[PDB]
Design a protein around this nucleic acid. Structure first.
Lengths: 152, 153
DNA sequence: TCAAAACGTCAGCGGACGTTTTGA
DNA sequence: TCAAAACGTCCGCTGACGTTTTGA
C-alpha cells in the first residue's frame, strides 16, 4: 500500500478537481450473475502531443496506464485495490469531486456483499446513480431501474 | 502583496495545470500610442451550476472576479500587479503551464519600458507569440507581425 | 493614452458514458 | 462468474481567442 508524499497529494487533488473524472458504471454483461458488471474508473485526458505528462503520472502514481484515442490520450485507473488506496489518500484534499470520491470508496467496500444479495446489489446501483448525477451525465443508458427490471 | 501558503499554492498549481488558461493578447485599439493593447488574462471555467467554486476562489485568491456567460462561468484575473504576484508565487510548482507563466512574468516586467520604445514593444509582442504557441491556439488574428507592419507607418 | 472590464464567437474536442473481449 | 482491458462515440461546451467601451 504505497503512501503518497503529501505535497504530491495536494497538487494531485488540485489537478483532479480541475480536470479529473470519477466514473461509475453498470455495464450490461450476460456473463455476470446479476447480468451487469459494476465498473469504476478514474480518468484524466490530455491532448496527444502532451501525453508525456500522462506517462509521468503512470510513474508518479505507480499504477494505471495510458490510452491513446486519436487526438487525445487518457490516463486510466480501474484496478479496484489501487483505486481504493488512491482515492482514500486523495479524498481529504478534494474540494469539487469529493462527493464522487466518497461514493466510490463506499461502493468499493461493499462490493463483496453486493455480489451475494440482489437487494444489496441494487442499493449499490443507486450509489452509482448519485455519482452519475454529480457528474455532467449526457449519454447514460443503464441505471438502477434498468437493474430493478431484469432482476425480475 | 498577498503571501500565499504552500498548501494553497500546491493545490492551486495542480488546479491551474489541469484546468487553467494563461492568455496573452495584442488587442488592436486606436487609442493606444502603438495602436495596440497588451492584455494578460488568467482564466478558469466552471459550469454555472458550480459557480460557488469560482466565487469561493475570488475570496481565497483575494483578487479577480467572476463572470457568468450563461451555461459557463469564468474566474478572471487581468489586473497586472495582482497577477504578477500570483504567478510569481505559483510558478515554482507548475508542471504543465510553467512556460506560459514565465513568459507572462517577463512581459509584465518589461511593460514599463515597452511603452517608451516601439522596438522593445515589438519584442515584448514576440513573447506573446510564444504563449499562444504553448496554448492550443486556433482563432488568433493579431500577432507580432501585425504590430510590425502597423508600426512601420 | 492607458489598465481594466465588458461582452461575442465557435469547432475540436473530451467528460462521460457505451459495447465487447480477454484471461483468469 | 469475475476484474480489467480494449475500444467506440456523442454533444454541450469552452479554451482561447476576438472587438468594443469605460474611467482616470
Amino acid at each position: 500500500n504505497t503512501k503518497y508524499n503529501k505535497e504530491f497529494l495536494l497538487y494531485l487533488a488540485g489537478f483532479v478537481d480541475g480536470d479529473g473524472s470519477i466514473i461509475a458504471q453498470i455495464k450490461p454483461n450476460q456473463s455476470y450473475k446479476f447480468k451487469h458488471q459494476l465498473s469504476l474508473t478514474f480518468q484524466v485526458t490530455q491532448k496527444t502531443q502532451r501525453r508525456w505528462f500522462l506517462d509521468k503520472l503512470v510513474d508518479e502514481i505507480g499504477v494505471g496506464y495510458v490510452r491513446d484515442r486519436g487526438s487525445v490520450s487518457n490516463y486510466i485507473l480501474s484496478e479496484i485495490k489501487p483505486l481504493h488506496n488512491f482515492l482514500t489518500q486523495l479524498q481529504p484534499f478534494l474540494k469539487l469531486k469529493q462527493k464522487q470520491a466518497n461514493l466510490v470508496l463506499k461502493i468499493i467496500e461493499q462490493l463483496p456483499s453486493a455480489k451475494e444479495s440482489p437487494d444489496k446489489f441494487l442499493e449499490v446501483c443507486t450509489w452509482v446513480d448519485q455519482i452519475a448525477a454529480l457528474n455532467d451525465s449526457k449519454t447514460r443508458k443503464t441505471t438502477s431501474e434498468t437493474v430493478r427490471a431484469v432482476l425480475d
